Amino acid sequence: TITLVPAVVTIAPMYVIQNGTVIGSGPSLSSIVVYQGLPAYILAQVSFAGQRVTTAPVSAQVYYPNGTQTVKASVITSGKYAGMYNITIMPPTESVQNYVFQLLIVANYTTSSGQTLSTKYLMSVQANQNLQALVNKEISSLVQNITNLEKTVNNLQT
Amino acid sequence: TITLVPAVVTIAPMYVIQNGTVIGSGPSLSSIVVYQGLPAYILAQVSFAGQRVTTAPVSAQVYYPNGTQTVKASVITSGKYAGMYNITIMPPTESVQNYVFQLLIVANYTTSSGQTLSTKYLMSVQANQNLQALVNKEISSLVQNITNLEKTVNNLQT
Amino acid sequence: VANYTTSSGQTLSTKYLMSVQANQNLQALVNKEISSLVQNITNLEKTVNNLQT
Numbered sequence: 001t002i003t004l005v006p007a008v009v010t011i012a013p014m015y016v017i018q019n020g021t022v023i024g025s026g027p028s029l030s031s032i033v034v035y036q037g038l039p040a041y042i043l044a045q046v047s048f049a050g051q052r053v054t055t056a057p058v059s060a061q062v063y064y065p066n067g068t069q070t071v072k073a074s075v076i077t078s079g080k081y082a083g084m085y086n087i088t089i090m091p092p093t094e095s096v097q098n099y100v101f102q103l104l105i106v107a108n109y110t111t112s113s114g115q116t117l118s119t120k121y122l123m124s125v126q127a128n129q130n131l132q133a134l135v136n137k138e139i140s141s142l143v144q145n146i147t148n149l150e151k152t153v154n155n156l157q158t
Numbered sequence: 159t160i161t162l163v164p165a166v167v168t169i170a171p172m173y174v175i176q177n178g179t180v181i182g183s184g185p186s187l188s189s190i191v192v193y194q195g196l197p198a199y200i201l202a203q204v205s206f207a208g209q210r211v212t213t214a215p216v217s218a219q220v221y222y223p224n225g226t227q228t229v230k231a232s233v234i235t236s237g238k239y240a241g242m243y244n245i246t247i248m249p250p251t252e253s254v255q256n257y258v259f260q261l262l263i264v265a266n267y268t269t270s271s272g273q274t275l276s277t278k279y280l281m282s283v284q285a286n287q288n289l290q291a292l293v294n295k296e297i298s299s300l301v302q303n304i305t306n307l308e309k310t311v312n313n314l315q316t
Numbered sequence: 317v318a319n320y321t322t323s324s325g326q327t328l329s330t331k332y333l334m335s336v337q338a339n340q341n342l343q344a345l346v347n348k349e350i351s352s353l354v355q356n357i358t359n360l361e362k363t364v365n366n367l368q369t
Contacts, residue, residue: 018256019256021256022282022284023256024189025188025281026189026281026282029189033284035256035286095343129342132289134346135289135296138346149307149361152364153314173335180337183336184332297349304353304360307360
């Protein structure tokens with residue numbers, strides 16, 4: 001005897017690849033620390049009954065605090081991540097603090113039993129500061145003020 | 159007739175304590191926001207049934223980009239952190255990139271269910287840049303410049 | 317902690333051990349440090365310009 005349970009479509013963010021590096025591992029996140037100005041490639045598999053499905057057009061509502069980006073995630077057709085949908089968020093660099101935006105991943109799977117299932121996964125993608133660029137630029141302007149001051153102080157010595 | 163339902167062994171990190179500071183709490187975290195250069199003491203409980211078991215010793219093949227350090231997790235029995243496996247990870251002090259370094263957590267639990275249940279947790283660790291350091295050294299180079307300059311102007315005043 | 321007494325005849329209390337790193341606000345740090353250094357520099361610039369004059 002084989003006792004079936006209903007199957008519910010899932011789109012889960014399996015890896016969040018940013019800087020060519022797994023910053024987010026597995027679906028054990030629903031908020032990830034992403035560092036701004038680098039593209040977090042959220043590889044989010046879509047599986048019905050744990051078996052990855054190739055027909056489920058993924059809309060992705062990317063809720064920036066300025067405009068809402070609807071990126072149609074490209075089905076991963078190469079790599080060992082193939083089958084999944086690569087959701088290419090690219091966060092602007094708005095560094096002075098953290099900023100909200102919510103990636104509501106919506107995989108709309110068409111079941112062949114006639115029960116079309118829209119599954120909507122909320123990951124709160126926490127755009128942490130990427131303060132590194134702001135720092136180097138501010139600091140370079142300070143180095144330039146210091147070298148000019150050195151030069152002036154040499155003229156004064158002369 | 160009393161049918162005992164399957165218990166499968168679970169290792170979940172109950173604490174990741176890093177720089178003496180618990181960055182990870184709950185067994186709700188099999189990914190964690192590690193800050194580079196700081197020794198993360200992954201105090202991970204090993205449980206069958208959801209009950210703590212201290213007869214499964216845990217190694218950790220920690221795949222740095224400078225080799226694999228296979229660390230046998232020592233049980234710290236002190237304080238409220240007692241009876242957890244200390245998976246000792248030592249992330250690089252580099253801070254030009256977020257780099258993927260793996261953490262193949264292997265727990266081999268000899269159960270009396272009839273098989274030696276070996277559970278593997280591949281946590282692909284997010285080496286997240288500890289920029290604080292880079293901030294402090296750059297700013298210190300700047301102050302060294304402020305003093306040198308300040309001494310020279312004062313000498314000129316004299 | 318949420319202490320809830322169900323009306324089914326079983327009392328359930330949940331405690332959630334949310335142990336958190338209270339991380340330094342690096343943003344507010346860097347901003348104040350550099351602004352303060354800009355003022356130390358304004359005082360140095362001031363001596364320089366007096367020197368020149």
